[PDB]
From Swiss-Prot, chain D:
Protein name stated in the entry: Coat protein
Domain of life: Viruses
Localization in the cell: Virion
Entries under SUPFAM superfamilies matching the protein: Satellite viruses
RNA sequence: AAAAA
RNA sequence: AAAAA
RNA sequence: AAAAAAAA
RNA sequence: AUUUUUUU
RNA sequence: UUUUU
RNA sequence: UUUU
RNA sequence: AAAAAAA
RNA sequence: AAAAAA
RNA sequence: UUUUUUUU
RNA sequence: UUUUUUU
RNA sequence: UUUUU
RNA sequence: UUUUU
């Protein structure tokens, strides 16, 4: 291979874009309370802690969830997801339970292509229900 | 296969080196505080406990971590890693969380070929962040 | 190839060993007197000059010898080796002579697998006989 | 059909009333914190293993497993340092558990050149651990 | 092959048996009287002289008998075997005679799979008849 | 073929050894008593009767035994062998008997490679038991 | 292979020989004077220094020679070999000269099969002529 | 210690270069050794990120 | 899908 | 798979 | 062959 | 195809 | 070839 | 089979 | 026709 | 070759 | 792919 | 008949 | 899929 | 399946 710099015969000025797009999976936690649904805000996806504070819209592709803390005594962990959309909220409750009390509960849902539009900070991704006090979210989305 | 000593028709004196190189991965532990990142010194790789007290430089290739103690109550173990380089520190935070509260949390990162230079004891390998008070590291490196 | 750091999906904590083994070819010299057999000590292999000051035993596999100085006047260089073992010394005298007064003499022997046990510093490897006053030894062994 | 038959035996054969025996011997040893315990070979010769008639043995491999729980907040670990009469080793083959409730395991194989006999007074390996009763399984050849 | 010790990546604790079975060929001699059949006790198999004093039961597979001393004057050696069982003794007399007066007489019998149960020291294997004062026995059996 | 002397275009002085090894099969006899075991000394291998008084050590590979004299009256010849090793003696009593009173008894054993080390005159190779007063031994060994 | 002793089902007593033959290559030196031919005695082959003091005859096959010391000033080394036989000496002078003043001069000759009879110590192998004061000889022979 | 500046000289047509990427080094003994000795030579790689041993 | 490893 | 030119 | 890091 | 029986 | 299962 |  | 082999 | 999903 | 190896 | 490094 | 060719 | 070959 090359051990020194080499010359590039660059031609015309190309098409450029100083602010491109970025497909990412954003790991962040949300605080969930017993017998209560938490509307996950899209604004949690725009932050300097994920390098996405320069974005104002994002296209969510798939959401996954894991329980972040231990379940109540004598109970196993569970976590539910209800997809939310501006054109109409869903009533599905994708539930995933843990078969071991010491192990996390996990579940996720994929957003179809016909429902993959941009979402701003004031929007919400989904509702979360769990017997645990905190839920770890990993959202695969496209920032633009 | 032979049962007796046999002669070796040796020739000219060969090329020798009394202090060769060594490809190792060093297991050693560090103490971590809550909400604080601990810088892993390179001088931990040089010790008589690893037969590496004769070296002064080392070329690190990959680092991996495990939580050495139990996490706080109601928490799952996690561990983060931020690679550091003398030419420029990274801002990455490769995190690994445990799905079982009784299980370690593991994560690692690989150093590319273009960044595999030597490091002396005063240098640092990476920062570590974890809710556990100790972390076990296995640093695959090349002592020279 | 790659140009930046990449995450490693590490798993369970592996089997580690801080003090491993090491197959080495150790070069060192011995001062020999004319007509007198010099017993080469095993303690000469364990030295910080060879990065082997952390070992206490070694499994010798093959021994090779070269005359380090010029022979007496009107003579050619020669060097002999008699293998020694804690279970019974041998009487072989593997000799190598030089066909040139300016050139080194060389000879070597291989220890059979059945006789490849450990040796501590207080032991001896073999006896050397030569008309030259110094002999260079290159010993292929396995430190443990 | 399902009844006895006769064997047309020939000359008297070569016999050996006390032959060899390749075995895997499970036993446990008590270990202290921060102290290395020397495992005696004499623990392999016992009526609990049908080996009280043997006086020597050729060891091939050693494997260890912690038998009791580690200290609080700690994970289990176990180290093995091979020992030989021709020269002790300095390796510390260590194995740790990724779960506090799970044993820590590690082992080492003896090469086909250091496989000589060892009597009861001989030692096989040093053991370090944070648990108090690590268990051992040793594959060896009694003779 | 390897000249040093290697690491064994052991896993979970296996299944163990400190007291295993043993298929053996037990050689022992019994004294026989003229015109009198001798019941071979099974307890002859359990002995420290066979490394079998730790067993209390054995499954006999076959029995082979050789004459151990010389026959009377002018006669050739012979030996008979009558298998004995707890469910029902046999009346077979497997006889082997010697064609040379100076040569042992040999005979044996095999126990079928349907008759291969355990026996204790109080039981008897077979009856031995011979014109020689002593008979050697090599019993192939499974200790358990 | 050639019928006269032929010139040899010799080159450099080669590697030499005036005292090499020797793979041999050494026969001798030992006097044995009744019921008592006789430890066979290794020093019997080093004698001018076998061209071996120049060796001090030897690597034994296999031992075989025969009964050298006639057995007691009415008995058949037998001979046992128990291997001895400096690291640890064996308890195996390899035994072979004679099916003819006028015929010798024979038995032997082979030493594994891992147990093939050197033995000096002060060492013992095996024990011998027989009902005959003398035993003939043939030992395959590698003198060094 | 095997890790323990195994039984050898030996048969009848074989054919043995305590003092076998030995095909050897014997190295030794002889002093030679300038202009004088030195007869090499066969008795030099029989020595304890070669493990051959138990032989009284030998069948010589081939003889090679090397100059053991440096030649006179300005001269190159040479060495001549005139074969000798009890039935009749030869007049050949197999000579080899060195193309470097610092290197040895080598030559040799092979004895045909028809001339490979035994030779006792009182006989002579060949005459040697050289300008150096010592000559090294390697004799491939068959001691019997 | 072999200086890198020895590589920049008009005797090598290289006095216009201020930097250089070294790939391999080879050495030979230029003068005769002391009496009764054989020549030897050792090389110890040095780097700005860390000296070898 | 004979024994032990 | 072992030796001794 | 070689303990260590990896790996359908 | 390591050991102990059975094995042409 | 020579010496060894 | 002997040679360089 | 310039760096490390050319089998 | 990155980041993500299969 | 780092250190020792095996018939010019 | 191996190939890899700037005109 | 964007970027850089 | 033993016997006898
Ligand atoms: Cl260094
Ligand atoms: Cl040296
Ligand atoms: Cl030969
Ligand atoms: Mg030369
Ligand atoms: Mg335990
Ligand atoms: Mg020189």
């Amino acid at each position: 291979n090359s051990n020194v710099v080499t010359m590039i015969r660059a031609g015309s000025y190309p098409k450029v874009n100083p602010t491109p797009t970025w497909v990412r999976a954003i790991p962040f936690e949300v605080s969930v309370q017993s017998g209560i649904a938490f509307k996950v805000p899209v604004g949690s996806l725009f932050s300097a802690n994920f390098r996405t504070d320069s974005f104002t819209s994002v296209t969510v592709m798939s959401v996954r969830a894991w329980t972040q803390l231990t379940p109540p005594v004598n109970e196993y962990s569970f976590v539910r997801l209800k997809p939310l959309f501006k054109t109409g909220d869903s009533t599905e409750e994708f539930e995933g339970r843990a078969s071991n009390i010491n192990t996390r509960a996990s579940v996720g849902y994929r957003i179809p292509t016909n429902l993959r539009q941009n979402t701003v900070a004031a929007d919400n991704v989904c509702e979360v229900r769990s017997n645990c006090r905190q839920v770890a979210l990993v959202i695969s989305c496209c920032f633009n």
